């Protein structure tokens, strides 16, 4: 499964945020428009996408920009059906329970911001922005969207920017 998830993430145009040769984060295109975590500095690893001017949203520490329709051709597919269970992402599985996403300890660190969370159908359900040490596991700070289109950010108390 993880192999297929990585293949889908690579085939879909996704590009890390390069600064001085160091990967400081990741950015992706979902729903035909680029998003980028504001706290991560640097430029997307795509000259064509870098040409797009972004807008800031301090409340969520996220940026967004318009993507040309021809490049909107193949982007992430979002869904609002988020039942309890387990999902898949770049560094393995993620447990969804009580409305929160959690992964085993040692998974995720500074520089992983921007990795989406995929369902069994390969549809995006959340975007990972950070996390906090949770003993045997760690809880990720993510943003998810309901069927009504409301942006909800779940942030654990004293969450670290990962």
């Amino acid at each position: 499964k993880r192999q297929r998830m990585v293949m889908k993430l690579e085939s879909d145009k996704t590009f890390p945020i390069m600064l001085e040769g160091k990967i400081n984060g990741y950015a992706c295109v979902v729903g035909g428009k680029l998003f980028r975590p504001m706290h991560v500095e640097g430029k997307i690893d795509n000259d064509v996408l870098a040409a797009l001017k972004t807008k800031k949203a301090s409340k969520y520490d996220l940026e967004y920009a318009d993507v040309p329709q021809n490049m909107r051709a193949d982007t992430f597919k979002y869904t609002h059906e988020k039942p309890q269970g387990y999902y898949s992402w770049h560094h393995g599985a993620v447990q969804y329970e009580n409305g929160r996403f959690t992964v085993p300890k040692g998974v995720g660190a500074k520089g992983d911001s921007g990795r989406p969370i995929l369902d069994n159908q390969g549809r995006v359900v959340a975007i990972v922005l950070g996390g906090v040490n949770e003993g045997s596991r760690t809880a990720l700070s993510v943003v998810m969207w309901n069927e009504k289109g409301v942006t909800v950010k779940y942030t654990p108390e004293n969450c670290e920017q990962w």
Binding site: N146, K148, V150, T151, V152
Partner: protein
């Protein structure tokens, strides 16, 4: 020649100036209330889910 401080008023024009000073204060108080209401609506819409 008492010349009370509030004696140089002209009733009508004085009320006009009262509308010029403090009337904008009432306007900005109404605007503050409306902005607070809009913010509370946004918070309610976000927390609703």
């Amino acid at each position: 020649h008492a010349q009370t401080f509030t004696a140089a008023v002209s009733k009508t024009a004085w009320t006009w100036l009262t509308s010029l000073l403090g009337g904008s204060a009432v306007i900005i108080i109404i605007g503050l209330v409306l902005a607070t209401i809009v913010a509370m609506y946004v918070l309610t819409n976000q927390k609703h889910n």
